Design a protein around this ligand. Structure first.
Ligand SMILES: Cc1c2[nH]c(c1CCC(=O)O)Cc1[nH]c(c(CCC(=O)O)c1C)Cc1[nH]c(c(CCC(=O)O)c1C)Cc1[nH]c(c(CCC(=O)O)c1C)C2
Ligand SMILES: Cc1c2[nH]c(c1CCC(=O)O)Cc1[nH]c(c(CCC(=O)O)c1C)Cc1[nH]c(c(CCC(=O)O)c1C)Cc1[nH]c(c(CCC(=O)O)c1C)C2
Lengths: 357, 357
């Protein structure tokens, strides 16, 4: 139903095969650092943008017109899942996401939709995925994505960003039962959503556990890890059952240094790394059979084009030329220079080829 | 809404009325042979230039500050239409236009936008037309333009220039149905685009069938001519319906010697000629009721100012002083001398007046 893929380097590396060079992409490659992103986004409010296949497709394509990135990622939000479960969410400029009525007690779970119906509420995402895959015309693979259960829970309880997650963690300690219930609702919504993304055309999937860092090992193993594992097991199972090829799945646990061994056993092809983990230490944690993605400090792009090249060279030396996809350790920041993102991409390609030959 | 036209000679001649002199313009009069064109163009990438009304207006005006040309043509590209249908196109300096993902099989037509929405994607062209018509302040008429369906198809399939059109012609012979489908998509996008150009201020329209020559009579009559005829019929119909004055339309089929009789019956006021067709033979083909445009070998401008004058004199003798707009037989080449373009313009004006008096 879709054009044949021309550059599959990203997929080959995700599965752990050898390639001629290291593939690269950037979290938030479609983002506010691009003037053209801001121009397209000035037309609608944020979630209206998410609900327009043409707008999502356009924002996805923009970075690919500037840089020879080895993957695209669909424009959407992780917060579409809580929204489709029935929570109201806003993204007013200057303030970040807010839920005006967060979940604060167990009884608040009653407001949520049955998780089995979330996928049908998210048809607009699938339309954006199909459109973008057709428009990409096989240039590079298209990544779909969602938030991990714990991270989604933090937003639902905290009502937005938090430096401590004190309310969400209070749920874990004081309301463990109701927490597991919410986390299971989330998992059961995520699975059919992620499956649907692949049915619509996604060629890989990333699960963002952006708030792993707040947990620590004991809480992470009890409350985050089981649902991370269940997402992967279930998504692969449903795809096989529907006659489709399962896709490479990436787990990105920001500030998750402490969980790398477990994440390596959690049924994901790729483990994404923040910039605080030394590549060689990550490699000792995860072993020889998963692919690593990352992990340059996004702020390194504030440095000169030449220094970026040298930092990239050092990073590639540490990861080595096997089982590795280059990216930053988090997303691009809004004040970053597009030319420096350009330099990061060119340096990965240049030094990875030098490192092989 | 616009200034009254001061010099309408070009329009009078297009409609076949007598004038005091022969009006002249040059394909690519805004082009790389002008140092000031290159300076304005060094600021942006090519399609960013196309999307800036001020930049398009400026490039349009430049040649008119050097030479008393009898028409302006808006700065744009024919390839904006395939781009607005959803194909990615580049114009890297030194390489010409490229589509990295050309159409290669019938199923690839699925990626394209509904042709009814192309005009709204091309609003920036209409903004450039309105701005330029206002800035011209009635000096001379402003021509809008587009590629003809077949020619646009060649780019979409071949992915760029070709000496044979072997892939595009393979479509015509092996995929006739899918070819007609593409050609109809193109026609249905072109019509509302061309209409929009006139709504925005265009005072005439040229359709460039630059790749006619590759066809020959049987394929041209089956695959190019029907859509050329449909463009004109439909554009005139929509303009009448909207309460506007239809504009003179020019069909330019480069290397189309073999189609001149049919082109004369295709509902265009003006038939443009390449330099390989002797003017008197063209006149026998098209009859007494269309206007001819052309047709000096662009390379003749490599000759001395004096020789250019003599070649122009011979050309004007052959066309005669009725139903004729002077131009070259194709566009100006980048290494041509602006003073020689100057001499071509002055010679047309001088000898056409001598030929009447
Ligand atoms: C994949 C994605 C996301 N957001 C957006 C996209 C699509 C564009 C892209 O690929 O980044 C658009 C996307 N999302 C947002 C923006 C900027 C909105 C604006 O102000 O106009 C855009 C373009 C806003 C946003 N959205 C979010 C925040 C963080 C809130 C906090 O904890 O303080 C913020 C600031 C939640 C969010 N959103 C996302 C994550 C996971 C990655 C990460 O950790 O950064 C998370 C945690 C993922
Ligand atoms: C009307 C127009 C066109 N292109 C451009 C304009 C505006 C300036 C002008 O009036 O010429 C800018 C215009 N278009 C281009 C340039 C030069 C770009 C650069 O290298 O910087 C400019 C100023 C590049 C171009 N664009 C095209 C080619 C030919 C490719 C091939 O078949 O080999 C090329 C080389 C496609 C094209 N473009 C156009 C045609 C029809 C006329 C013709 O046959 O020449 C065609 C066929 C029309």
């Amino acid at each position: 139903g879709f054009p044949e893929l021309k550059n599959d380097t990203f997929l080959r590396a995700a599965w752990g095969e050898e390639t001629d060079y290291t593939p690269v992409w950037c979290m938030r490659q479609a983002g506010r650092y691009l003037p053209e992103f801001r121009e397209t986004r000035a037309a609608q409010d944020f979630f209206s943008t998410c609900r327009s296949p043409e707008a999502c497709c356009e924002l996805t394509l923009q970075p690919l017109r500037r840089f020879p990135l080895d993957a695209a990622i669909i424009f959407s939000e992780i917060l579409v899942v809580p929204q489709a479960l029935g929570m109201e969410v806003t993204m007013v400029p200057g303030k970040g996401p807010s839920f005006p009525e967060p979940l604060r007690e167990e009884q608040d779970l009653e407001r949520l939709r049955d998780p089995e119906v979330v996928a049908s509420e998210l048809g607009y995402v699938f339309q954006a995925i199909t459109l973008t895959r057709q428009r990409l015309a096989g240039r590079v693979p298209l990544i779909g994505f969602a938030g991990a259960p714990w991270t989604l829970m933090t937003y639902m309880v905290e009502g937005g960003g938090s430096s401590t997650m004190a309310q969400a963690k209070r749920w874990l300690y004081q309301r463990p039962q109701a927490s597991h219930q919410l986390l299971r609702i989330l998992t059961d919504a995520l699975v059919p959503y992620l499956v649907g993304q692949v049915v619509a055309g996604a060629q890989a999937l990333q699960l963002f556990e952006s708030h792993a860092g707040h947990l620590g090992p004991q809480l992470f193993n009890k409350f985050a890890l089981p649902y991370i594992r269940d997402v992967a097991k279930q998504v692969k199972a449903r795809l096989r059952e529907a006659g489709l090829a399962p896709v490479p799945m990436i787990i990105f646990a920001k500030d998750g240094h402490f969980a790398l061994e477990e994440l390596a056993q959690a049924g994901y092809e790729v483990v994404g790394l923040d910039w605080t983990v030394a590549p060689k230490k990550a490699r000792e944690c995860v072993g020889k059979t998963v692919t690593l993605q990352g992990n340059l400090d996004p702020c390194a792009l504030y440095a000169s084009e030449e220094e970026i090249g040298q930092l990239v060279k050092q990073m590639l030396d540490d990861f080595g030329p096997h089982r590795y996809i280059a990216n930053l350790g988090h997303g691009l920041y809004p004040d970053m220079d597009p030319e420096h993102v350009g330099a990061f991409v060119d340096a990965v390609h240049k030094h990875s080829r030098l490192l092989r030959q």
